[PDB]
């Protein structure tokens, strides 16, 4: 959520910055609600005061007939409860609006309508020239018997996979390599997190209220009927960022750099048509996430650092990619600035997204009440949060299989992964 | 499900074997339903025949007024549809009974009422004598800051954990070691499986119809409204065993030995009281599963082999345990014979279940229609299925932390795990 006082003080300026995302801030409705809120707030607080006073008058005469006084306190209590509910319903209408507002893009972000307006910043490696017709990862999967989509339709349904044997081992090897890289060389602490999360968590990172439809939701448990409305995690950004919810972190302890290897679950609503075949656009997919909790003045530097960490995975793996600065119109909900790394995909003859590194500014920190404090001063302030994949494991497996395929369909194991595969050079 | 002809031919004998589990087979109701089924079946099949014949009489005269004949075929079609529905409702009542019948215990299984009647077969290693008061894994978790239950209550709710740092790394190290042991030394092929499964899968391994309440269920997706009634996997036995559903496997290709590392999800319904604190009885927990698909005559040998594989993990890790032959009254629904490995838990001053290895006989194979065929003969037969954990990773972490704790709370890394931890000797 945006700073409420920034919406109060200069709403036309924030609406202008938000218009660059293609978002129309309803400034008039927000104002009309806010003006009614002050009227209800003065009435409620006056009722609270007079109920508190009449309650004290009873206990004073009780020591000294507490009946005509007792009736009045019940009439005021009825009045105050009605007043408080009426105010709360209005507070809930303001929240419906405020919490559906995307983040203000930082001035570094190029102005754009959509993905066609994204700016290329960097490019690394040169796409492989093949001496045969390139096979896709699905075709190679079938040749090895290692990627079985039909078995996953049988166990579950569409947009699921069963990996079998050496290709399943290679997928594990990729995740191990990424976790070891970030924990051993990049200063990230490793975490095992729940894959089911509550509504507070989802509100905290921005999935709720606007993106409930993107999630798999669980039915409450009979023995936890009022505390088990859970959703499956769509990214480890959700559990990891929420670890600092309702915390005051000493600035000396920042940055907090966390990594996790988890499955991610997406309903893929609206994706009716785009990427029907393959490990791309799945309901279930593994990712090795990087999350940073930093001091407000270090977030821009941390973004460059984190993007560099995801780039390092691609470079060590010998996978050519392009680095893209996302424009105002192609950014995710919580982000103020984003870099997407797009890996070369031989069968698609283009680069495809494999990492999306974002600086969230204080947008999630405000929702979570995540703040920091220098012991030197009497001043707490919201932290900045960042997240990015290093990398989407399923998409890395696609890029690896396709870029390293041999004429006969064998997969060459990238040199940096051979220690993770007992020195094995080829699958097949 | 049990063989329908074994229920038809000798129901008093199967009811006798089932009574040893403490299960009363309603032989009288099954018989009454079966007698009505034959009456409805003769009526339906007679209606099917006469509708088929009257339909053919139309097409014969159509070549040669197809109106008094067309009315009759519609009256018979109405009659047949009603007859078929009435029969199907009765078929569904037989299924409600047949599919809630547990497996017949094998004669090897000792007769018992409950867990207090289980027979100890073997014992390995000697429980450690400590020179200080033993701390539990929760206390050690807190000392290291590596096991955070409060953070998991915040992200989700109770019976969840957040593992942070070195203890999170050690948990990953355990799973890697188990997967490497079974794939490199024990002949298991590695698999990546969906963590969400459909109703057919659940019926196949026996979770449905009787144990829906033990599961986390997902709400159907709007864009898959009639094909996304999924549940979270409670064990990898569910997706792995179901890979052979509707298959005729060449006997030469058996045994099919599969392993996976997955999170497992349990609602823990009825567990109100038992194990309130710790990594024991969680809603989410990791397991390294072993599943075997074998020829009917090799299942008993495969059980001993598989139990030995789970024992090997414990022996290499230097964790003392006891091997227990479960009695008739303490077996799981699908099992005909089971061995439980119970690991020594210093803070509990007892052995606790860490693996449950079962021979399922043809019980799941019958539900899944999983069969094998020798090319030499014109004879298909149901395969036998087996499953067991090698091991429950969370429970291994508990046993490791507690058995290897040092006076100051440091955790000694078992010698066999040090290569998985970059040679690290101690955590802390
Ligand atoms: Ca510091
Ligand atoms: Ca994007
Ligand atoms: Ca974001
Ligand atoms: Ca063979
Ligand atoms: Ca048991
Ligand atoms: Ca079983």
From TrEMBL, chains A, B:
Ca(2+) 1 binds at residue 252. InterPro entries: aa-tRNA-synt_IIb, aa-tRNA-synth_II, aa-tRNA-synth_II/BPL/LPL, Ser-tRNA-ligase_type_1, Ser-tRNA-synth_1_N, SerRS_1_N_sf, SerRS_core, tRNA-bd_arm. GO terms for molecular function: ATP binding; metal ion binding; serine-tRNA ligase activity. GO terms for cellular component: cytoplasm. It is found in: Cytoplasm. L-serine binds at residues 235-237, 266, 289, 387, 389. It catalyses: tRNA(Ser) + L-serine + ATP = L-seryl-tRNA(Ser) + AMP + diphosphate + H(+); tRNA(Sec) + L-serine + ATP = L-seryl-tRNA(Sec) + AMP + diphosphate + H(+). Residues 30-100 form a coiled coil. One of its GO terms (biological process) is selenocysteine biosynthetic process. Residues 169-414 form the Aminoacyl-transfer RNA synthetases class-II family profile domain. Gene3D superfamilies: Bira Bifunctional Protein, Domain 2, Serine-tRNA synthetase, tRNA binding domain. Its EC number is 6.1.1.11. SUPFAM superfamilies: Class II aaRS and biotin synthetases, tRNA-binding arm. Keywords: Aminoacyl-tRNA synthetase, ATP-binding, Calcium, Coiled coil, Cytoplasm, Ligase, Metal-binding, Nucleotide-binding, Protein biosynthesis. ATP binds at residues 266-268, 353-356. It is an enzyme of class 6 (ligase). It comes from the Bacteria. Pathway: Aminoacyl-tRNA biosynthesis; selenocysteinyl-tRNA(Sec) biosynthesis; L-seryl-tRNA(Sec) from L-serine and tRNA(Sec): step 1/1. CDD domains: SerRS_core. Homodimer. The tRNA molecule binds across the dimer. Belongs to the class-II aminoacyl-tRNA synthetase family. Type-1 seryl-tRNA synthetase subfamily. Catalyzes the attachment of serine to tRNA(Ser). Is also able to aminoacylate tRNA(Sec) with serine, to form the misacylated tRNA L-seryl-tRNA(Sec), which will be further converted into selenocysteinyl-tRNA(Sec). This is Serine--tRNA ligase. It comes from Klebsiella pneumoniae. The lineage of its organism: Bacteria, Pseudomonadati, Pseudomonadota, Gammaproteobacteria, Enterobacterales.
